[PDB]
Design an enzyme around this catalytic site. Structure first.
Site, PDB file in Angstrom:
ATOM      1  N   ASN A  44      28.436  41.835  64.104  1.00  0.00           N
ATOM      2  CA  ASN A  44      28.212  41.322  62.763  1.00  0.00           C
ATOM      3  C   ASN A  44      28.883  39.975  62.658  1.00  0.00           C
ATOM      4  OD1 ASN A  44      30.874  42.285  63.073  1.00  0.00           O
ATOM      5  ND2 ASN A  44      31.081  42.480  60.829  1.00  0.00           N
ATOM      6  N   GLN A  45      29.238  39.445  63.813  1.00  0.00           N
ATOM      7  CA  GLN A  45      29.920  38.170  63.909  1.00  0.00           C
ATOM      8  C   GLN A  45      29.052  36.990  63.469  1.00  0.00           C
ATOM      9  OE1 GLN A  45      33.269  37.447  67.491  1.00  0.00           O
ATOM     10  NE2 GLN A  45      31.674  39.033  67.472  1.00  0.00           N
ATOM     11  N   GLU A  46      29.700  35.904  63.082  1.00  0.00           N
ATOM     12  CA  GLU A  46      28.983  34.703  62.700  1.00  0.00           C
ATOM     13  C   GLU A  46      27.837  34.878  61.733  1.00  0.00           C
ATOM     14  OE1 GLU A  46      29.010  31.172  64.090  1.00  0.00           O
ATOM     15  OE2 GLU A  46      31.135  31.758  64.175  1.00  0.00           O
ATOM     16  N   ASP A  47      28.100  35.480  60.585  1.00  0.00           N
ATOM     17  CA  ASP A  47      27.072  35.635  59.568  1.00  0.00           C
ATOM     18  C   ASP A  47      25.902  36.581  59.780  1.00  0.00           C
ATOM     19  OD1 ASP A  47      26.549  34.127  56.799  1.00  0.00           O
ATOM     20  OD2 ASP A  47      28.107  33.013  57.923  1.00  0.00           O
ATOM     21  N   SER A  48      26.030  37.521  60.700  1.00  0.00           N
ATOM     22  CA  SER A  48      24.973  38.501  60.892  1.00  0.00           C
ATOM     23  C   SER A  48      25.655  39.819  60.566  1.00  0.00           C
ATOM     24  CB  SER A  48      24.439  38.483  62.333  1.00  0.00           C
ATOM     25  OG  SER A  48      25.464  38.654  63.303  1.00  0.00           O
TER      26      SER A  48
END
Ligand SMILES: [Zn+2]
Ligand SMILES: [Zn+2]
Ligand SMILES: [Zn+2]
Lengths: 44, 33, 65, 134, 266
Positions: D1-5
């Protein structure tokens, strides 16, 4: 049984050059009722 | 007396049937209230 | 747009309880917050489900053929 | 869920979370020619021209339209029409190569000029997948 | 008895509040998971439509008929379509339902999971019945209709598990906690001023001895005693959603032994 009327939903149908109106409601729309070939669906 | 072209009409405005229409009238008319 | 059968989050049935809830509202003159507790909807995952559904279908039904 | 996902509960997606419908509407008319030369709606075959499509015409009934229950896909044809020129040059409308779904509702009407006007419509359900935006 | 013991606290027909004691966290959890995901159930999975004029679209409904819980007491004596030898499906591997509804009334006719009618033979066994817990006995409002709106389907429910889809889940929410008085320091409460004052004390705090300052940190302290609570949707009786859990997980560990031997051969 084949086509239909948008408002006065009344099974109609016909063939080429039979105008495009319904038997009563002039409303020149007309849909095309389902298929007899039953369709299957995944249930998920 | 004479015919001079056609003026498209804004929906829901004075000159549109929908204007005076009501709840039930519309749903029958098929337009969404 | 009809009641969601079961809760997205935890899967607990909720389809039935639409009608019931809607009565413990109009008839039994209760408040949402309890009408729910009454129906066994403990935690919000299930709660949020009913308290929020907007039964559009009713407005749909009102059309024609 | 890293970097805006984000990560999304699959179970929830099944129980019906965030599903959506999707309709698209192809349309068409039978061209008119001042000097009575009209096109038509029909389920054609060779008969000279051959300039026809590549996908199945079968799903096509006889008025040149599909029935509202049929499951369509690939480049399947949704409308059969022919242009007369001198005999049978095609003019059908295939379901956009990408998409696929089910015919929702068909409708046959007249257009001021007394021509055969028709619109088809395909419904599709789209469940949340991985690359999806939210 | 011998190993990991139990002491059911409260209990009903839809919830088995209880205390799993002297077990391994690993195991406690494994069990938890197993319950939620790999227990066999029955649910609609193929919906053949003949006619529909409702305002809801074909698949829309279909989706739903999937989650309408179904009987599944005797599920463990019905085969998976995939394993039965019929070309596609049979009473040996599946249950068939029917549903029909015409808007006779002049005021919104309702379609409930109760109007589902089994057709295939159940060869006598509790299976395929639309579980109802509704007060008035209708359960799950499938869909509504108006004037002359018809709706004729035909369903086919099969075995199946959570992994495959959720409609086959029989669990639905499963309370789980342990060491209510953070005694193992498995957490480190966030606070503004005071930990204890700002962070709610659980009901489970009771059934376990309070901290008591003085004492040093018991590091050797592993972790036993878990306050679960398995609710159920119905399909299967709350108890079973625990017994069969314990069973399934059991059989899995079994298979590893088993395959570990046909592998002995060479
Ligand atoms: Zn008419
Ligand atoms: Zn929930
Ligand atoms: Zn079989």
């Amino acid at each position: 049984l084949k086509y239909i009327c948008a408002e006065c939903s009344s099974k109609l149908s016909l063939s080429r050059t039979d105008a495009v109106r319904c038997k009563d409601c002039g409303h020149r729309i007309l849909l095309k009722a389902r298929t007899k070939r039953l369709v299957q669906f995944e249930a998920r | 007396k004479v015919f001079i072209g056609r003026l498209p009409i804004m929906l829901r405005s004075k000159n549109c049937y929908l204007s005076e229409a009501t709840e039930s009238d519309l749903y029958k008319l098929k337009e969404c209230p | 747009m009809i009641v969601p059968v079961r809760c997205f989050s935890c899967g607990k049935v909720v389809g039935d309880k639409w009608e019931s809830y809607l009565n413990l509202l109009q008839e039994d003159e209760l408040d949402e917050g309890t009408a729910l507790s009454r129906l066994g909807l403990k935690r919000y995952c299930c709660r949020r489900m009913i308290l929020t559904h907007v039964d559009l279908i009713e407005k749909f039904l009102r059309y024609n053929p | 869920n890293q970097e805006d996902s984000m990560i999304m509960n699959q179970s929830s997606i099944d129980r019906g979370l965030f599903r959506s419908l999707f309709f698209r509407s192809y349309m068409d008319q039978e061209k008119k020619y001042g000097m009575s030369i009209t096109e038509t709606f029909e389920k054609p075959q060779r008969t000279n021209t051959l300039r026809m499509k590549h996908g199945t015409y079968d799903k096509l009934d006889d008025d040149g339209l599909i029935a509202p229950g049929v499951r369509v896909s690939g480049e399947d044809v949704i409308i059969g029409k022919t242009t007369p020129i001198s005999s049978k040059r095609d003019a059908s409308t295939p379901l956009r190569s990408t998409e696929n779904g089910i015919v929702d509702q068909v409708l046959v009407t007249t257009n001021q000029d007394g021509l055969k006007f028709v619109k088809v419509r395909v419904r599709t359900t789209k469940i949340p997948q991985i690359g999806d935006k939210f | 008895e011998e190993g990991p013991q139990v002491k059911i606290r409260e209990a009903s027909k839809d919830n088995v509040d209880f205390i799993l004691s002297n077990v391994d966290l690993a195991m406690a959890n494994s069990l938890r998971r197993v319950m939620i995901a790999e227990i066999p159930t029955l649910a609609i999975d193929s919906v053949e439509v003949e006619t529909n004029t409702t305002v809801l679209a074909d698949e829309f409904i279909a989706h739903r008929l999937g989650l309408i819980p179904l009987q599944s007491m005797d599920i463990e004596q019905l085969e998976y379509s995939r394993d039965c030898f019929c070309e596609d499906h049979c009473d040996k591997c599946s249950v068939v339902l029917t549903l029909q509804a015409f808007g006779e009334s002049e005021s919104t006719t309702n379609v409930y999971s109760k109007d589902l009618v089994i057709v295939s033979n159940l060869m006598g066994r509790n299976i395929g019945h639309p579980i109802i817990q509704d007060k008035e006995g209708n359960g799950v409002l499938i869909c509504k209709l108006r004037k002359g709106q018809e709706l004729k389907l035909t369903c086919v429910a099969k075995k199946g598990i959570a992994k495959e889809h959720a409609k086959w889940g029989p669990a639905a929410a499963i309370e789980f906690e342990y060491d209510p008085w953070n005694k193992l320091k498995h957490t480190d409460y966030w606070y503004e001023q005071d930990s204890a004052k700002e962070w709610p004390q659980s009901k489970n705090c009771e059934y376990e001895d309070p901290p008591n300052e003085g004492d040093p940190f018991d590091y050797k302290a592993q972790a036993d005693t878990f306050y679960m609570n398995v609710e159920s949707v119905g399909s299967i009786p709350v108890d079973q959603v625990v017994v069969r859990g314990i069973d399934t997980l059991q059989k899995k560990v079994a298979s590893i032994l088993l395959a570990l031997t046909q592998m002995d051969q060479d």
